[PDB]
Design a protein around this ligand. Structure first.
Ligand SMILES: CCC(CC)CN(C[C@@H](O)[C@H](Cc1cc(F)cc(F)c1)NC(=O)O[C@H]1CO[C@H]2OCC[C@H]21)S(=O)(=O)c1ccc([C@H](C)O)cc1
Lengths: 99, 99
C-alpha cells in the first residue's frame, strides 16, 4: 500500500505471538520496541535519540510481520516512547519514499 | 524521486540562504534542525523523543527548498543530533510511503 503522511504512519505488526502498532520511521536506522519478551538470547546495548540515550536489549533474528509482510532482523527492546520500525526492517518489505 | 531505504534518506535543503543536508523522517511530525542562524522572532518550546526532551526555538512560516521542492512551515531549531524533515513539510512536497 501507499501511505500518505497527513497522519502518523502506524501499522499493525505481529511479533512474538503478540499484536502491536508500530510507526514506520524512515528516520530510524534501527527497530525499537517497548518492553516485551522476544524469545532467545540478547546482548545489552545503548541507543541515542533527540533527548539522549536509553538502554535496550538487542535481540537478533526476530520474526516480525509488518502489515502482513514478513521480515527477520535485529530488534531492540527498551524504554522507547513508541514502537518504531527502522530501516533495518523497512528494506526487507520493499518500502520506499515517494515525492 | 523514488527512494529506497538501504541507506539513510538524506537530502539537500535550502533554508535561509544556507545549504544543508537533512533526513526525510516519517517518524517526525514537525521539522527539527541543528543549530543555525534563522532570521526572525522565535518562541521556546520543548520536544521529546528517545532519551528525553530538548528545548528548541520555534519558527513559523519558514521557506525550505527540499530537493528542488519548495515548502513553507514551522521549523524547530535546537540541539538535534541530526537534521530531520518532519511530516509537516513532507506532505507539501508530496511524500508518500510505498511498500
Ligand atoms: C521514538 C522516537 C520518535 C517518536 C516518539 C520521534 N523521533 C523521530 C525519529 O524518526 C528519530 C529521528 C532521529 C534520527 C537521528 F539520527 C537522530 C535523532 F536524534 C533523531 N529516530 C530515532 O530516534 O531513532 C533511534 C532508533 O534508530 C536509531 O537511529 C537514529 C536514532 C536511533 S524524534 O527525532 O525524537 C522527533 C522529531 C520531531 C518531533 C516534532 C517536534 O514533532 C518530535 C520528535
Amino acid at each position: 500500500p501507499q501511505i500518505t503522511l497527513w497522519k502518523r504512519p502506524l501499522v499493525t505488526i505481529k511479533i512474538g505471538g503478540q499484536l502491536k502498532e508500530a510507526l514506520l520511521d524512515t528516520g530510524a536506522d534501527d527497530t525499537v520496541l517497548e518492553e516485551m519478551n522476544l524469545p532467545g538470547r540478547w546482548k545489552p546495548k545503548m541507543i541515542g535519540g533527540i533527548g539522549g540515550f536509553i538502554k535496550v536489549r538487542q535481540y537478533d533474528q526476530i520474526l516480525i510481520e509488518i502489515c502482513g509482510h514478513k521480515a527477520i532482523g535485529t530488534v531492540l527492546v527498551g524504554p522507547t516512547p513508541v514502537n518504531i520500525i527502522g530501516r533495518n526492517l523497512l528494506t526487507q518489505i520493499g518500502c520506499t519514499l515517494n515525492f
